[PDB]
Nucleic acid binder design. Structure first.
Lengths: 64, 97, 130, 348, 353, 394, 64, 94, 130
RNA sequence: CCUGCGGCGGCCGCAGGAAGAGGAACGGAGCGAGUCCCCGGGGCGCGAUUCCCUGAGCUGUGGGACGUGCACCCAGGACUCGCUCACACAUG
């Protein structure tokens, strides 16, 4: 997978083929992580996402 | 006496003060009766269900052992079996619609 | 370079190994690569930890998205395995003896290099919680 | 070899250095295993220690003794004892019972020092209550243990909360207080309970029905010993000068009174010979006194193991060895180290 | 000086009233009510509650008995039992505030307790993991009572935390946030089984009862006795007015619905809350939701159940905004002013004519 | 001073004073289809609300999931049919659909509609979509300007053929070059296009048009109609974890961040707020007549697709507007719109048609034999009724 | 009993078993004083709580 | 062999084993798939495999017959098709 | 050392005894305990202040919460009994030959330490009152 | 004629309808009773041999013995059958 990105000042994705930003740091991979339906690590993912305050519920609430 | 058949109740985890703590692994996540006899697959009674604890879909149970049994006898991941009439469905403990 | 790699870091990447502990870990990995004791990638490490193996699980702190490997830290805590985040993904793959980056590797003990392994293991066991 | 206190006991190695790890540590008695293989010691650090019989005895200077096991409790250890029918030839018999503050009665394996079993005593509210005393039955089938106004009887074969409860105080009548010691008659089918409430009680083994209730002591009773005759027995108390001699015949009143300095709230132990002729006791002053039981017990000897309280004394069941445990609680002021010791008491 | 105060610094249920949606600004004020903080001391206590710090010997029903001797009142309630040896936050409602006890008893609690382990564990992290395992919806056997075996039940633990561990005594402090009716004694037994060493709850303290906590407004039993004594012997209210708080403080989380003075007495008599009497209404009122209906002086009239959403109220011109759940205010606090309005007058006129 | 504020709170009297100024609402922060509810033109305020439905955001969790959708970030192994089948299995739900078929190796926005939101799938499948792909040129090119000129040329209504059928027309609205790498001959392009546009085919045509030849290396969908990749986008792990957290902790919080109500898809459309009595009639397939219109939005035109909503903000149906805004404001009677697609279930709101004055009058005349059994006139009908009553069947 | 506490810089209770806090001050018992309903020392407690400015009526009034 | 032929398009730069051509057919009429392409003398060059570009101005690639080569054709060289394998824009447009 | 204990004092712990007066009071308590002429608990001290038994009442200035013993200063002022605070409860218990602390002690007069008693009594009554 | 659902992009089949869109007191409150839900002998004080006790037994900010007295064991919610007060669209 070649497609990378870095976030703009506006907040939207700036797509790129390079593995570093203009400002030095690493570009993230555009595609989401692989998933399989047999996964039984929901407890595990939630448990540490709570610890570091990165669970989706703990983020600022969206504008509707 | 000995029941006609027995269904998988759970597997052995660590002993705790002369009774044995077991992870519950029932089909449809069914919950055992309190003081329900626990059998090995040979249909010999090792004890009775004392405590039931933990999360709804990942729960444990302790087993108060029989007169002749010792907690050192059992090995890790050893399976235990229960009379299927002495289970209840998980829906009972889940909230009313 | 070590201090520069903190800019690239991941929200869940703690406890992070120090500059010196990172150096010690690479060399323990390289020794384990020669004896073929390590296990590489999520698919293999997840399989072997579930199977019953023990050792030290070295995670990469540059990994994104976090969903690829954020289940592993709790898989260790269920079986009391020590784990630690090193700063880079590309350095872990180079130390592991591969042409590409890698997000996680598990180093197993061996009689060939127990002195270096023990220095890392006890320092990693001593790491404070975040 | 046979016991003889015509001469002062000769010194034999003890342990002092490990007890000095904590500040203001002190021993809380010592007890030989009933086969005579090793000695068990309690201490203020809440660590039971087992010391083997010195190899240099059978093999002169002796090195400082080192314990083969240390088995740690997490709270004050109220009582501890060897299994009644212990032999070092059988791993199934060699184990140590131990009770502690707000904890179960733990059973420790005397070879490996692992927690082997737990007996648990709960009150009517289903809250755990700790046993202030322990005693195995002379068959080794049952484990008797004292509480406030009640004895419980666990079956040694089935470790757990299951127990036969025996109330000693019912509708303000009977033996009151915390039952601090139990002991069984070698000949008769009975046991004697001492309490921190001044009185002694005798009870039948099979039923737990009261046989007698005895006064005498002016403080809380701390220890009991039956004579190998079966008729005669002895008792001692805290902050109380007299060691009272009793008899199952001519009961109701103590036959004799033996003086000893006890000025603290401590369990100052005393022990008889295996033959039953001599009686040895410690003291808060330090002086270990000896009486010949064979009339009133005649004073034989008095000697000083150290310049400190001698809380524990224990006599070896086959050999002529006296063990002595030392130390006591030091009291502060606004702004000598304790030790186990062995002593040869054989004849010339 | 009230003119200088921002609306965010107005007391209790009148806090941030300008950010409610305004239906109409016109009504005729009546000299009937007071602000809940300025009620005459008799009335103030009869509509009040105490955020008590329970002592460690008596049962919770004994404690509220003692409070009703002291203050000389006939009714009290207590926001969930604490066991005789347990301390901490016990909301004691007095008289007319006892109408709120189910909302206080059903609220989420927090506890700080000590578990004693019966053998050594590896360390504090091992206890911390067994607490994470007992987060979420848990099975717990309710204790036997009068030989009546209650069935196994489910209670949620929202959060858990391991605060401290002492390897010497094998003692561990834990903090637990949980659903009402959770047995913490049972939690410590399970926490012991899960570790394998065994365990018992040594000690317990409740640090929160829903809206109230030990952080602020909490008083001891001595304050309650002491404040009453000062009122009995020196006729000074000042101490009692800091021990007792008005029941409106218990309702500050609820969505509000402000009514005209004409409507107030009608609602106290059992009239449904109609739309022509609504002055202001909060954002986020949903259907079948429990709301607080208040006067323009900030007095709680009733707990009501909303039959119109916020948006529906904005569009309509008449009809049932809410039905009563429980009336808080007495009858005839305000005068009878119903039947005087335009449509209701037209109805009675056209029946007569 | 904090203590000075505390002293004023207990000393001085507080009152929400009477005023003569006009009561002005601010509905700009109200959720979804209730946003700027104040700005709608009001026909009447006189009706009886029913208290049966709910605000879309505050439906009970069962009803919330059944009337909802997920802005999914599709993972790169499975097919789009397989992905919605997983979500169907996870959420323990009967039916599921999506907003456009992404190929197995393509990732990005996939609006997974659940149960009763699957009535919108035809509208979501026909919506305009944006992609970011990588074209892999077989031979080298002079510069990135040539590949941009090829994309400039293919902006417009194009001929296209499916991959391995008939020739088809597909418009590409806008196209752009993000960057080009001459070493590995890869070029990132972004394209906005209508639904059903084949991007594999576009990459081949870019290769042919340049002369070097080429193909699609990989693809990602960044927009699907109204939803984008920076608008509440969620992964399959989140969907699985959110369901798990609801199962084991009884916590709906995570599901309500993952799933959103179908009304969030309809926020672009013009609104027609119906009276609560008219709601269930429309769900059964009635005409959207004038007596039931409470409010109507500015700038409604004839043949415009409008969303018809309740007073609580629920979507009843998508509909075609027959009257303009100006006509609805001035007319006495008529058909305001006709149903395109009924979203809301039958008997969500109760069954309250035929109870009105003019409807009850017609029922009475049929009972009296003044009209026929099928509500049609006779010779005996009064000239007042016969002239006034404009029967819409005609 | 066993629970002690000390206040952090924002007035929250920080629970602990240890008799001294991290700044060397003694920790308070978590539990309130034992109460008797037949207590006849109400005069006496008001008398010296007034004297040392620590009666509840003399503190800063709470913001409601 | 065709009865009569009508212009198909002019030569544009070649591709890998194909020739790309800009269509200049009368009234923009679109050629059919797999239709034979001819020279001015009715000698078949290849067969039309892909058709692409905007509706008014579009291109077509020709899969060459085995005898021909892509490099040989001159700049703006014209190519032909039988009129029965053409289609109007009005089929595709609406 | 004395100034460190001064951090732990109550709001109501005045008059606090001077450093040398604190030392005199401890030495007087030691002699009174030896003679069996003190009262230790609030439970006890309260009972014998009610009966009207005279003595110097020594209080621990670090006692919390204050509700346990804060009624006692006024009980003394009703009967004109001399009272005084001292830095710590542990040292007050230690003065009476005890490892556990205590918040109050009342020293009765006696012949064997009558001069030491009068020397303490004299300075206690001379203290400035808040 | 409309809608919904299913089958193979229009038709087929099945199902629900045929809809003009009503109602400015509907049908409430507060008590009391019966029945369910909820629902871990102890707590407090004083007296005398300082009533005993710094126990290694929790414990002097409290533990115990004997006299003695005292106050606790509800309050809520739901259902059901009474009594009381209303039957209220909220006065520009």
């Amino acid at each position: 997978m070649f497609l990378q990105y870095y976030l703009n000042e506006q907040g939207d994705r700036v797509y790129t083929l390079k593995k570093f930003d203009p400002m030095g740091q690493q570009t993230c991979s555009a595609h989401p992580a692989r998933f399989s339906p047999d996964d039984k690590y929901s407890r595990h993912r939630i448990t540490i996402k709570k610890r570091f305050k990165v669970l989706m519920t703990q983020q600022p609430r969206p504008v509707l | 006496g000995p029941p006609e058949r027995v269904v998988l109740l759970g597997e052995f985890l660590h002993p705790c003060e002369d009774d044995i703590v077991c992870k519950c692994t029932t089909d449809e996540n069914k919950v055992p009766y309190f003081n329900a006899p626990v059998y090995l697959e040979n249909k010999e009674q090792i004890g009775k269900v004392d405590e039931i604890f933990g999360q709804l879909r990942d729960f444990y149970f302790s087993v108060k052992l029989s007169e002749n049994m010792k907690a050192s006898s059992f090995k890790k991941l050893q399976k235990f079996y229960i009379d299927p009439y002495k289970l209840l469905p998980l829906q009972r403990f889940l909230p009313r619609p | 370079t070590y201090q520069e790699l903190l800019v690239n870091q991941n929200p869940i990447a703690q406890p992070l190994a120090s500059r010196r502990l990172t150096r010690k870990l690479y060399k323990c990995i390289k020794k384990a690569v020669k004896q073929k004791q390590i296990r590489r990638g999520v698919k293999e490490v997840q399989k072997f930890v579930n199977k019953g193996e023990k050792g030290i699980m070295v995670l990469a702190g540059d990994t994104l998205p976090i969903e690829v490997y954020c289940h592993l830290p709790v898989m260790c805590e269920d079986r009391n395995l020590p784990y630690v985040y090193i700063p880079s993904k590309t350095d872990l793959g180079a130390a592991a003896g591969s042409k590409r980056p890698t997000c996680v590797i598990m180093v197993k003990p061996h009689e060939e290099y127990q002195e270096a392994y023990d220095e890392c293991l006890e320092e990693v066991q001593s790491l404070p919680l975040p | 070899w046979n016991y003889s206190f015509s001469q002062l006991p000769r010194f034999l190695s003890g342990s002092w250095s490990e007890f000095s790890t904590q500040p203001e540590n002190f021993l809380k008695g010592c007890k030989w295993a009933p086969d005579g293989s090793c000695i068990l010691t309690n201490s203020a650090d809440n660590i039971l220690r087992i010391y083997n019989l010195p190899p240099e005895l059978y093999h002169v200077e002796y090195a400082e003794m080192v314990p083969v096991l240390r088995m740690v409790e997490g709270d004050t250890i109220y009582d501890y004892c060897w299994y009644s029918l212990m032999s070092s030839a059988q791993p199934d018999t060699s184990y140590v019972a131990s009770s502690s503050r707000e904890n179960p009665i733990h059973i420790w394996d005397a070879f490996t020092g692992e927690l082997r079993a737990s007996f648990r005593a709960y009150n009517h509210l289903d809250e755990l209550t700790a046993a202030h005393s322990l005693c195995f039955s002379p068959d080794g089938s049952q484990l008797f243990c004292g509480f406030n106004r009640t004895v419980r009887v666990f079956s040694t074969a089935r470790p757990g909360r299951d127990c036969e409860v025996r109330a000693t105080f019912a509708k303000k009548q009977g033996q009151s207080g915390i039952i601090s010691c139990i002991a069984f008659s070698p000949a008769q089918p009975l046991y004697a309970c001492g309490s921190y409430g001044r009185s002694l009680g005798l009870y039948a083994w099979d039923d737990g029905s009261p046989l007698a209730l005895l006064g005498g002591h002016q403080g809380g009773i701390t220890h009991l010993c039956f004579h190998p005759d079966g008729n005669r027995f002895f008792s001692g108390a805290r902050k109380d000068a007299e060691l009272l001699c009793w008899d199952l015949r001519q009961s109701g009143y103590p036959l004799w009174s033996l003086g000893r300095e006890v000025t603290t709230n401590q369990r100052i132990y005393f022990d008889l010979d295996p033959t039953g002729q001599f009686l040895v006791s410690g003291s808060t002053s330090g002086a270990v006194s000896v009486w010949d039981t064979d009339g009133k017990p005649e004073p034989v000897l008095s000697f000083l193991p150290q310049k400190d309280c001698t809380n524990g004394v224990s006599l070896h069941p086959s050999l002529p060895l006296l063990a002595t445990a030392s130390g006591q609680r030091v009291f502060p002021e606004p702004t000598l180290e304790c030790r186990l010791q062995l002593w040869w008491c054989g004849g010339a | 000086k009230v003119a200088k105060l921002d609306t965010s610094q107005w007391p209790l249920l009148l806090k941030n009233f300008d950010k409610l949606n305004v239906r109409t600004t016109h009504y005729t004020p009546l000299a009937c009510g007071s602000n809940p903080l300025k009620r005459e001391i008799g009335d103030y206590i009869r509509t009040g509650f105490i955020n008590l710090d329970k002592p460690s010997n008596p049962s919770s029903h004994e404690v509220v008995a003692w409070i009703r001797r002291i203050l000389r009142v006939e009714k009290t309630g207590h926001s969930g039992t604490l066991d005789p040896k347990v301390t901490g936050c016990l909301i004691v409602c007095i008289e007319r505030a006892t109408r709120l006890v189910k909302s206080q008893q059903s609220a989420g609690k927090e506890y700080v307790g000590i578990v004693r382990l019966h053998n050594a564990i590896e360390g504090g992290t091992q206890l911390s993991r067994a607490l994470e395992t007992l987060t979420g919806a848990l099975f717990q056997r309710p204790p036997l009572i009068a030989a009546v075996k209650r069935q196994l039940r489910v209670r949620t633990i929202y959060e858990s935390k391991m605060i401290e561990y002492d390897p010497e005594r094998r003692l561990g402090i834990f903090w637990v946030s949980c659903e009402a009716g959770t047995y913490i004694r049972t939690l410590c037994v399970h926490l012991g089984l899960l570790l394998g060493v065994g365990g018992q709850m040594q000690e317990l303290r409740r640090v929160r009862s829903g809206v109230m906590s030990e952080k602020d407004h909490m008083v001891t039993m001595h304050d309650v006795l002491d404040a009453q004594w000062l009122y009995d012997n020196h006729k000074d209210e000042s101490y009692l007015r800091r021990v007792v708080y008005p029941l409106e403080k218990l309702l500050t989380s609820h969505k509000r619905l402000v009514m005209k003075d004409s409507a107030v007495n009608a609602i106290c008599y059992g009239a449904k809350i109609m739309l022509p009497g609504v002055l202001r209404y909060e954002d986020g009122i949903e259907v079948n939701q429990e709301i607080v209906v208040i006067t323009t002086k900030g007095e709680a009239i009733c707990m009501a159940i909303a039959l119109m959403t916020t948006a529906v109220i904005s569009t309509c011109d008449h009809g049932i905004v809410a039905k009563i759940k429980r009336v808080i205010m007495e009858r005839d606090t305000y005068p009878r002013k119903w039947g005087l309005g335009p449509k209701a007058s037209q109805k009675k006129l056209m029946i007569k004519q």
